[PDB]
Amino acid sequence: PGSAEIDYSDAPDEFRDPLMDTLMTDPVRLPSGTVMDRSIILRHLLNSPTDPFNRQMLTESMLEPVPELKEQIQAWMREKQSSDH
DSSP: OOOOOOOOTTOOTTTBOTTTOSBOSSEEEOTTSOEEEHHHHHHHHHHOSBOTTTOOBOOGGGOEEOHHHHHHHHHHHHHHHHTOO
16 A cells, blocks of 8 residues: 655654654553553553553553543644645
């Protein structure tokens, strides 16, 4: 297939993940109150049942997806795409 996307290098640091240095798209809140990317937290759980930047205990049942960031991210990505013709 020939499918492709706009480069999101213009995204703010509150939309980007720290490990992969890109737009997370799925923000997920931890029991510490910290927000992380869905894929980075589940990738660290495979190594140990702990947080990726502090190693306090963490389980999948303690996680909750963030709506107020995900709904802002999808609106922002729409404007980056509609700027092209």
